Swiss-Prot record, chains A, B:
Domain notes: The C-terminal propeptide is required for normal protein folding and secretion; it maintains the aerolysin precursor in its soluble form and prevents premature heptamerization and pore formation.
Source species, domain of life: Bacteria
Covered residues, full protein: 343 to 395 of 493
Protein name: Aerolysin
Record-stated family: Belongs to the aerolysin family.
Originating gene: aerA
Primary role: Secreted, cytolytic toxin that forms pores in host membranes after proteolytic removal of a C-terminal propeptide, leading to destruction of the membrane permeability barrier and host cell death. The pores are formed by transmembrane beta-strands and are approximately 3 nm in diameter.
Site feature: Important for heptamerization: 32, 48
Length: 53, 53
């Protein structure tokens, strides 16, 4: 879907309402991009914030 | 360099001050992305506006 102009959680905070697709893996960890738990836990490291804020 | 938050001419109008590199070809046409004249002339076609507004 398209991210809202007012505010979205993507780290670049786009404001052009872009079409966007992202896959999470509900289950065991496989990679950082698709792991909600990894991103959530490492939210205290700005350098690891590459997908969702 | 990094595009200004207030306003830039990239068609997505980013507001995260991203580092940005773009090459123009000063001389004969080679491709649409690097041709100022092509982009300028075709500015009446929204679908051809893929690099600079």
């Amino acid at each position: 879907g398209f991210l809202r102009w007012g505010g979205n959680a993507w780290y670049t905070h786009p404001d052009n309402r872009p079409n966007w697709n992202h896959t999470f893996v509900i289950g065991p960890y496989k990679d950082k991009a698709s792991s909600i738990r990894y991103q959530w836990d490492k939210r205290y490291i700005p350098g690891e914030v590459k997908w969702w804020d």
